[PDB]
Design a protein around this ligand. Structure first.
Ligand SMILES: NC(=O)C1=CN([C@@H]2O[C@H](COP(=O)(O)OP(=O)(O)OC[C@H]3O[C@@H](n4cnc5c(N)ncnc54)[C@H](OP(=O)(O)O)[C@@H]3O)[C@@H](O)[C@H]2O)C=CC1
Ligand SMILES: CCc1nc(N)nc(N)c1C#C[C@H](C)c1cc(OC)cc(N2CCOCC2)c1
Ligand SMILES: [Cl-]
Length: 225
């Protein structure tokens, strides 16, 4: 009942997201968007959750973790159970799927979680294609003069486009109300593909904030007792 939203910054056209345990770029305006989207809520009494792979947790600078004003969940196969408080603002879980079921319990959550953000790991993102209701994808393009950075971790663009459609016309409505963005909705062609979203430029890169939403599903079966 609480929306599950994958959120990621990916470099076009291969949708690379990482290299050697870290990000392949440093974009302050991209980080600002991420922080504000995942932190801010429409209901002032709720917080959002951020779920992440263990390797992604270990990549966040120790001073900035756990991410403030969000419930942090770190998933590891070596952790103890489905959703355990281990420190203030930190839950541990040995199962991505089970922790989500756990977080969706209104008895447990008191309807005080507004959104569940899946904030990554390539490995986590691979398993979230069937879990997420939406994807917030920052589509990043190196500007003409910019060197394409080396990358070893990738978003599954095939799986994304099988299950989700580009819903960027609804990005602004979809973001928490208090967020303000510098750009206006733009449609640009880039290396053959349509890039639609809210444009930003920083350092050697042009990027678009986009929103992907699950495709309409046929009604094949509804479980009756
Ligand atoms: N550009 C972007 O928006 C982002 C990029 N990244 C990048 O992604 C890379 C990290 O991704 P990746 O290497 O795939 O690692 P992940 O962050 O996805 O973490 C992988 C680990 O998570 C645990 N795990 C995976 N699936 C489950 C599950 N179903 N249940 C419980 N635990 C699970 C395992 O931990 P264990 O081994 O302990 O059992 C596994 O080793 C880095 O390069 C990082 O910079 C990360 C976030 C955002
Ligand atoms: C914008 C990056 C980002 N953008 C988008 N659109 N989605 C995401 N899921 C992430 C992400 C991410 C990971 C968790 C990350 C990596 C990192 O570098 C290893 C530093 C941080 N920080 C240091 C600064 O403030 C707290 C969060 C977060
Ligand atoms: Cl599994």
């Amino acid at each position: 009942k609480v929306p599950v939203v994958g959120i990621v910054a990916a470099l076009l056209p291969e949708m690379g997201i990482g290299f050697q345990g870290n990000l392949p770029w440093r974009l302050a305006k991209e980080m600002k968007y991420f922080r504000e989207v995942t932190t801010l809520t429409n209901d002032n009494s709720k917080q959002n959750v951020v779920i992440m792979g263990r390797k992604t947790w270990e990549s966040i600078p120790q001073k900035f973790r756990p991410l403030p004003k969000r419930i942090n969940v770190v998933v590891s196969r070596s952790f103890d159970g489905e959703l355990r408080k281990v420190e203030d603002g930190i839950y541990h879980s040995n199962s991505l799927r089970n922790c989500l079921t756990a977080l969706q319990s209104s008895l447990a959550n008191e309807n005080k979680i507004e959104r569940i953000y899946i904030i990554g790991g390539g490995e986590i993102y691979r398993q979230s294609m069937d879990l997420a209701d939406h994807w917030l994808i920052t589509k990043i393009m190196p500007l003409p003069e910019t060197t394409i950075p080396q990358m070893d971790t990738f978003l599954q663009k095939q799986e994304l486009e099988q299950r989700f459609y580009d819903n960027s016309d609804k990005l602004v409505d979809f973001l928490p109300s208090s967020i303000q963005l510098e750009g206006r909705l733009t449609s640009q062609e880039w290396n053959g593909e349509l890039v639609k979203g809210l444009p930003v430029q920083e350092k050697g890169y042009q990027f678009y904030f986009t929103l992907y939403t699950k495709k309409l599903e046929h009604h094949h079966h509804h479980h009756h007792h």
